[PDB]
């Protein structure tokens, strides 16, 4: 379902979906299991480029997020047109050895030709078996 995220830009993200999660309830990310995410956003600029930057922290300490394609133009039709809406779907592979934590912060930032396209912070994710 739709999950709650905090916008760190200008409300370009319209919706974030995660099958099996809802609103601001704890969203369990299961180790060794695929995790599906969908985002719908409005382009705030014409841009040839969309570069995705993921910062993640476990118990207030930054951790590397593996298996992320930085070129968001791989998952939608670039160049982006200002004011058009783009739907991006991605399945992330959760490592079987992922550190179990009840305090996970994920910040996803998409940078365009002229600065930020989109920014969201998700604080409800919990990594469990």
């Amino acid at each position, epitope marked *: 379902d739709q999950v709650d995220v905090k916008d760190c830009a200008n409300h370009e993200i319209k919706k974030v979906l995660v099958p099996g999660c809802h609103g601001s309830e704890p969203c369990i990310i299961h180790r060794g299991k695929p995790f599906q995410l969908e985002a719908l956003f409005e382009a705030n600029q014409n841009s040839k480029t969309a570069k995705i930057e993921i910062k993640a922290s*476990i*118990d207030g*300490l930054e951790v*590397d997020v593996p298996g992320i394609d930085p070129n968001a133009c791989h998952y939608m039709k670039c160049p982006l047109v200002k004011g058009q809406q783009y739907d991006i779907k991605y399945t992330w592979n959760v490592p079987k050895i992922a550190p179990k934590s009840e*305090n996970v912060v994920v910040t996803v930032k998409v940078m365009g030709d002229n600065g930020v396209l989109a920014c969201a912070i998700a604080t409800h994710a919990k990594i*469990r078996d």
Partner: antibody
Amino acid sequence: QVQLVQSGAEVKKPGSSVKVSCKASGGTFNTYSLSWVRQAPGQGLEWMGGIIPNFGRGNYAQKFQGRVTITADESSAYMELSSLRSEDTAVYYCATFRLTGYSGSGSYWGQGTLVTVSS
Amino acid sequence: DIQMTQSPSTLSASVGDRVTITCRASQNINNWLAWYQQKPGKAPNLLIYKASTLETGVPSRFSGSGSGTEFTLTISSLQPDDLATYYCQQYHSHRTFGQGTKVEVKG
């Protein structure tokens, strides 16, 4: 028993750099965060930085960013502090803490390393 | 940067008295607050984690509480063994220690 063994105390010249080691025995840093904390004589505890070994790079207090490097695998952690000045004289400790997805504190402290910055 | 304001810096009380130490966080740290005791000439030792969870072996006189940015450590009946410096530490974002409270046991 889980024991963290640190490098022995030493004298470092001003402007030199020091690399303190923290070796785990009787267990590993897996399931734990590792932090480096300094205490100057007569002063309070100061967090230099920390890391989740094998899952992330060093995280640093902005006062110490760029002068501190912390690196770590499941059995060894290191703190390197460069451009040493007299104010860096302190006992340096390594300390573990259980990740929040596991039970118990997992709190263990090294014996501490007295670094004296002096000519 | 999350700042921890700990009060008082120094507390003097008699054996059997109830002492309370306060720690305020500059922003929300949820329940991610720890309390350490440092006895003189010794390494710090954990007393409380997750705001109210007692470490194994810590005496029942020690208790922890909080309002999400406001946290308190209570010793229900101060003992001579409790002479020490007590430090709060947030572990929600990075880690920050309070300035510490030196507890003097009089009488």
